[PDB]
A paper describes a structure:
Host proteases, TMPRSS2 and CTSL/CTSB cleave the SARS-CoV-2 spike to play a crucial role in the two alternative pathways of viral entry and are characterized as promising pharmacological targets. The entry of SARS-CoV-2 depends on two distinctive pathways, cell surface entry and endosomal entry, where the transmembrane serine protease, TMPRSS2, and endosomal cysteine proteases cathepsin L/B (CTSL/CTSB) cleave the viral spike protein. The crystal structures of TMPRSS2 and CTSL/CTSB in complex with the potent inhibitors were determined to reveal their specific mode of interaction.
In light of the crystal structures of K777 and nafamostat complexed with their respective proteases, we devised a bispecific compound, named 212-148. An ethyl linker was utilized to construct this bispecific compound by connecting the pharmacophoric groups of K777 and nafamostat. As expected, 212-148 not only showed potent inhibition for CTSL/CTSB with respective IC50 values of 2.13 and 64.07 nM but also suppressed TMPRSS2 enzymatic activity with an IC50 value of 1.38 μM. Further, 212-148 demonstrated effective inhibition of SARS-CoV-2 Delta variant spike protein cleavage in vitro, albeit with a decreased anti-TMPRSS2 inhibitory potency. Further structural studies showed that 212-148 covalently linked to the TMPRSS2 catalytic site with guanidinobenzoyl moiety at the post-reaction state, the same as nafamostat and camostat. The ester group in their common guanidinobenzoyl moiety then reacts with the catalytic serine of TMPRSS2 to form the acyl-enzyme intermediate and cleave off the “leaving group”. The guanidinobenzoyl group stays covalently linked to the catalytic serine and disables the protease activity. In Calu-3 cells, 212-148 inhibits the SARS-CoV-2 Omicron BA.2 and Delta variants infection with EC50 values of 64.4 (SI = 5,391) and 235.2 nM (SI = 1,476), respectively. Although its anti-TMPRSS2 inhibitory activity decreased in comparison to nafamostat, 212-148 showed nanomolar potency against Omicron and Delta variants while maintaining good cell viability.
Author numbering:
A (entry chain A): 117 to 122, 126 to 216, 219 to 250
B (entry chain C): 256 to 495
The structure:
């Protein structure tokens, strides 16, 4: 069970339906992982985070993932990269579809062989390098 | 900052000076054009109201923060689990009335992601206008210094901080001292470079004295706070 500053059943965490009075179970379902900003989504069935495949991903999907993460209208970059998060399962996009995390399905591979690297804001750059 | 050096323009473009009554009080870190990460103890009552606060960006010298260069703060949000006694969960957010304009002098620092795989003694940087000596005055020029991460197990030793470092805290500095944050640096950034990107890993929170041996700096563990930060930012985006 996961608590939302009250715990909820795990299959109802990030299942598209709010169950916590404040909605904490449905508002932290997208996340950037590692120093390469690998886009990850929480799978309620597997109770784990999984990278998003580059297959059929576009800018407007990234912008919506950036909106879900709290970056509003901020968008910097999105490209496919080789997964370095050591994952074995992935979330592949179904086009026949709806919130970002409710549009994906479990896949053990990605056709493109790439995962989404998403940057919502141009940060972390100073004078050097 | 004790033991540091004066910062160059654009060296720390996310650093802001937070003012109350025309006087620097705390540091903060830009993460978006609207949002600043600072420390919750900076905004304890009576300074919890946003109208007291002005933020100055892209200016290195306190005497150069003229009337009209500041950005008026619109919202102050302390972490709901902040504890004044222990400084646990010492983080707060500040939203500006008008968004910053980003350029070579004013840019955000990146929020940390899970899976950064930092080294146990990762090389880090701190910056601010805090005193350059314990019990000293606010510094006129922005300073910065290199500090190493100190593993919490070592920091919680009987001879360092004796189990006072909670999972919402990290230690950085040198057990010999001589390089440390100090009064007026609190709320400011603890950043590290990885994958050619600067990440905000800590916000300057507290410590016993400044630059004293076996009393390093304690920083709010920004990684633990990212979920709360995202929720606040998304909730504000949906208007209030
Ligand atoms: C904040 O103003 C602040 C943070 C930390 C210290 N002490 C040490 N870093 N030892 C003083 C003041
Ligand atoms: Ca739910």
């Amino acid at each position: 069970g996961i608590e939302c500053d009250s715990c909820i059943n795990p299959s109802n965490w990030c299942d598209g339906v709010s169950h916590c009075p404040g909605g904490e179970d449905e508002n932290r379902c997208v996340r950037l992982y590692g120093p390469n900003f690998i886009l990850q989504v929480y799978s309620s069935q597997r109770k784990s985070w999984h990278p998003v495949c580059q297959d059929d991903w576009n800018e407007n999907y990234g912008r919506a993932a950036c909106r879900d993460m709290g970056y509003k209208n901020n968008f910097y970059s999105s490209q496919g990269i080789v997964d370095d998060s050591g994952s074995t399962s992935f979330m592949k996009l179904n086009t026949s579809a709806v919130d970002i995390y409710k549009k994906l399905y479990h896949s053990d591979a990605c056709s493109s062989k790439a995962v989404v690297s998403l940057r919502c804001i141009a940060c972390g750059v100073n004078l050097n390098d | 900052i004790v033991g540091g050096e004066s910062a160059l323009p654009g060296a720390w473009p996310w650093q802001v000076s937070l003012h109350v009554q025309n006087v620097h009080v705390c540091g903060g870190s830009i993460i978006t054009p609207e949002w600043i990460v600072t420390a919750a103890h900076c905004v304890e009552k009576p300074l919890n109201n946003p109208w007291h606060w002005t933020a100055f960006a892209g200016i290195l010298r306190q005497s150069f923060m003229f009337y009209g260069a500041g950005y008026q703060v619109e919202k102050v949000i302390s972490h709901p689990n902040y504890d004044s006694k222990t400084k646990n969960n010492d983080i707060a957010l500040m939203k500006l009335q008008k968004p910053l304009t980003f350029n070579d002098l004013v840019k955000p620092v990146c929020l940390p992601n899970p899976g950064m795989m930092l080294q146990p003694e990762q090389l880090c940087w701190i910056s601010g206008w805090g005193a350059t000596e314990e019990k000293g005055k606010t510094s006129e020029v922005l300073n910065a210094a290199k500090v190493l991460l100190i593993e919490t197990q070592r920091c919680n030793s009987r001879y360092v901080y004796d189990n006072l470092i909670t999972p919402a805290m990290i230690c950085a500095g040198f057990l010999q001292g001589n390089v440390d944050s100090c009064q007026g640096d609190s709320g400011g950034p603890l950043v590290t470079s990885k994958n050619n990107i600067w990440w905000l890993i800590g916000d300057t929170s507290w410590g016993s004295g400044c630059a004293k041996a076996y009393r390093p700096g304690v920083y709010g563990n920004v990684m633990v706070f990212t979920d709360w930060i995202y929720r606040q930012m998304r909730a504000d985006g949906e208007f209030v």
